[PDB]
Design a protein around this nucleic acid. Structure first.
Lengths: 101, 43
RNA sequence: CGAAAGGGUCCUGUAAGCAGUAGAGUAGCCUUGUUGUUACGAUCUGCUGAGGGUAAGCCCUCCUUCGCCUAGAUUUC
RNA sequence: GAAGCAGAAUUCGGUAAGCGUUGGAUUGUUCACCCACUAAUAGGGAACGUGAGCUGGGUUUAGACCGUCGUGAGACAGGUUAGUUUUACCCUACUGAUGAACUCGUCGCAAUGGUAAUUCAGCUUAGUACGAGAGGAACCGCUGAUUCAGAUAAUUGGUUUUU
RNA sequence: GGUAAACGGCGGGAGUAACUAUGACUCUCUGUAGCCAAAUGGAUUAACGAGAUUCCCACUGUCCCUAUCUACUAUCUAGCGAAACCACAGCCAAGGGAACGGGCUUGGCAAAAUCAGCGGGGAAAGA
RNA sequence: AGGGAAGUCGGCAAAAUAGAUCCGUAACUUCGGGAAAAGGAUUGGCUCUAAGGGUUGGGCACGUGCGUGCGGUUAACAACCAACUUAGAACUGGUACGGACAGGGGGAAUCUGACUGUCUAAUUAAAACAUAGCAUUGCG
RNA sequence: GGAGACGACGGCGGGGGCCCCGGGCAGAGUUCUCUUUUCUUCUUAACGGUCUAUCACCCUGGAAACAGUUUGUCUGGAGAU
RNA sequence: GAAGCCAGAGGAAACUCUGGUGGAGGCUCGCAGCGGUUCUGACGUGCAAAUCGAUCGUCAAAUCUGAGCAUGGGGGCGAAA
């Protein structure tokens, strides 16, 4: 079940992208950038319980360990194993390259 | 924030309802639920 | 001129069926495991940007077919 | 047009109604005052010299509490709550649409009626005129935007019974 | 004579010379959380409510600012087919002393027969 | 679309929430409640695994299918039969997994009537009426 | 003296009927492919006989190391197992 | 999820705690029924001299309802409008 499914495609209801999640996993600086764009006092569990793969905060360690056994987290893990779509793959799909000399 | 977290004054996402807790505290202050008084000046 | 058809242009998203040392696992027969073997089994892969639709207010076709035609009625300094 | 009006910003006055004159907050209340944007947020009439578009208050049938008065039925200095009017197919007006008589048709004329645009900003002039300094214009030329008006669907959105 | 002392009246406390009801005549009156009560010191009463009110988060076509789609109407045809209402009629302007004109006076004007709509008058509210 | 009550006397209307499993749930309170408070995690398909049952059946010595005298509680075993729940795991599609239907928006307070209930059929469903409890009067 | 003759609600057990599952005969449908397939009939009255069915009652006997027992804690020297 | 009951853990005992069992309540969500809150609802010479739609209250009882019978205008009946 999705909360307010009528307007889930609106820009103000947008969630984090999979390539951004890959860069967050690969680089802690990118994850730090994303976390400084938020306020720690408004986050669930004071921001201390965060799943990077789901890009989502939780109220407790019990809730985080709980969602890890669920299928949305496993769906995110399978999508990350497959690899997110990027501009490099978009260029390689049409046979386009960058010539820097 | 601690009063909201203790009393369950939470918005969507578990964020504390600071303004609602402030309204509750102010109402308790005026309606005689919190002890306070102004002492008389000493002669 | 009309009805089909063909080509184009768009829309969707890869048809039915067949096959597969793809498929988590389970159960049989024997070489008792050496894709052992056979069976079933969401799904996956290939045939397949395939299948389906396309003017109803899309385009083209003397040159792809079939049909229709010089009417009928009424009125008019 | 006038003013110590240097410039800039103004102030007083004259002709002028062509064109505009906005969101919004506050109902413990004579709802009138605040804040902002702006070129500016001017004032009135066509009701209120009684009076069927819709909808909140003055406002008030029947139910009910609370206060004041009254022996009481009840009435009020009052305060609160809930509560039935429900056309148009007629004539005219208005907006559009046809149309007889003048054979049918094509191209026209134009009496009369209507009439439409509006304001700001930026570049240049020019850091110039003017000025002790701080500051600081304008004419010509150029480019956008606000409000209004008339169209349109190449593109971008929206709409899907193309079921 | 006694009160349900119900209604009602009632600012207290002392005295006296009255001596009983009515008295009458003077006087003067202003603990930053305790103590005491059989844990509590309450009506600031929980639950319950198609009761009345204010606000917050979420949510949105209430707007801003409107657009589009569907069905049934409205439309046109065949059949069938009323009612309300109706002095007579319906274009306006100025004047028509009694603050009212639709008919009068003076002007503007003014061309058959019609259809769909509309809600300014005029009609229309068991008004 | 974007914004999210800027609309309106007034969030009227609409939207949002909604089933089930699990975590968790404050003030106040007549201690019974509040409470489904609040706030969170998940839900499809397929292939398996595990747990939860029923019926029948014990050796000797005699008399002769039963009667005794014994002997034993590993039947803790065999054979047959049977249905629906619950839990766990892998694999797999995805923009949706209570996929239609069905289905609480929630919260902070104030006034008010204790509650359940009843009435003005055909304008008023309510602080009105009734109610239990309490108090008074009359009657042997 | 009994019957006629008697409230509401809760769960439990027995029986009939219905629903559901398997086999078989017969018939019908489907059949590009699959489906030993899907569907249909397969019934037994009143009235009687006979053999049995919870409660309860009777006989023996006398129970603590208390026992029997329902989903639900009742029963027993006023005699239980 | 109230009494009552079972087991385990403590307490000299009364009682305390834990896990079950049980199924009470003018309790609660809600279908039918009964009722009638709201909507600038439909309808307004109507399908209707009070109907229709959605929404709403209640739903094991002070619930709903038939027939027979009783109360009759100076009256009756009235959880009182």
């Amino acid at each position: 079940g999705v909360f307010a499914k009528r307007t889930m495609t609106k820009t103000r209801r947008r969630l984090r992208d999979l390539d951004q999640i890959e860069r967050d996993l690969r680089s802690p600086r990118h994850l730090q950038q994303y976390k400084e764009t938020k306020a720690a006092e408004d986050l669930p569990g004071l921001g201390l319980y965060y799943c990077i793969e789901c890009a989502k905060w939780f109220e407790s360690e019990t809730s985080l360990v709980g969602h890890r056994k669920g299928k949305p987290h496993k769906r995110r893990l399978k999508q990350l194993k497959e690899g997110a779509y990027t501009h490099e793959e978009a260029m390689a799909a049409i046979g386009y390259r960058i010539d820097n000399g | 924030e601690m009063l909201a977290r203790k009393s369950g004054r939470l918005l969507k996402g578990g964020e504390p309802d600071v303004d609602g807790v402030a309204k509750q505290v102010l109402n308790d202050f005026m309606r005689g639920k919190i002890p306070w008084f102004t002492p008389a000046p000493e002669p």
